């Protein structure tokens, strides 16, 4: 409820990704705005190595769940935002089906009036000629649930969800999401009943931007 306060005007992001996927390794710098009573952010990324070895869509959801519109009703089973100023530590396992998994560990906090979601991933087991390091995915998101449950013993939560990522011949490139969320302060955080955030992305790119950029475009509302 205290860390609330800090959500109820425009906030800027910034996002820092350090990656290692197969032995490629490389780093992504995001910026952008979060609004958090329209559940909106807006934010755009950069490939500061120069070419991403992955594809674009599947960095998305590594790439601040604070930002989540929590309707009233649903504000006292708000985590993300409890945690705030001091802030979380998100750590995921994406598993993509029939290829790869990629490990990852962010650090979400406050910098002055900045929320930062500083990030290092790690992937391993793809296909050379897979639909990840293939590059045979395209660049859109589909419409997702995330669906969240109390975790008591780490005075966190836990996450799980199913990312559908369009591969270029018409089919499905799976992408099952397991999540943990753990405080970094000592203070009192929200622990939720069973509930899920409904997202929608929108991926595009800045005309005038010649080097490996994405913009991203998320809207997140809880319900259930």
Not at 12 to 40: M, R
Not at 57 to 76: E, G, I
Not at 131 to 157: P, R
């Amino acid at each position: 409820s205290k860390g609330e306060e800090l959500f109820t005007g425009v906030v800027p992001i910034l996002v820092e990704l350090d990656g290692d996927v197969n032995g490629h390794k490389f780093s992504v710098s995001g910026e952008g705005e979060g609004d958090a009573t329209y559940g909106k952010l807006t934010l755009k990324f950069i490939c500061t190595t120069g070419k991403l070895p992955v594809p674009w869509p599947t960095l998305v959801t590594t790439l601040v769940q604070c930002f989540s519109r929590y309707p009233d009703h649903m504000k006292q089973h708000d985590f993300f935002k409890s945690a705030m100023p001091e802030g979380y530590v998100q750590e995921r396992t994406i598993s993509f089906k029939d290829d790869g998994n990629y490990k990852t560990r962010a650090e979400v906090k406050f910098e002055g009036d900045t929320l930062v979601n500083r990030i290092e991933l790690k992937g391993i087991d793809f296909k050379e000629d897979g639909n990840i390091l293939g590059h045979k995915l395209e660049y859109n998101y589909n419409s997702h649930n995330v669906y969240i449950t109390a975790d008591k013993q780490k005075n966190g939560i836990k996450a799980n969800f199913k990312i559908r990522h369009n591969i270029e011949d018409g089919s499905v490139q799976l992408a099952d999401h397991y999540q943990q969320n753990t405080p970094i302060g000592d203070g009192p955080v929200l622990l939720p009943d069973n509930h899920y955030l409904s997202t929608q992305s929108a991926l595009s790119k800045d005309p005038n931007e010649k080097r490996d950029h994405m913009v991203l475009l998320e809207f997140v509302t809880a319900a259930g």
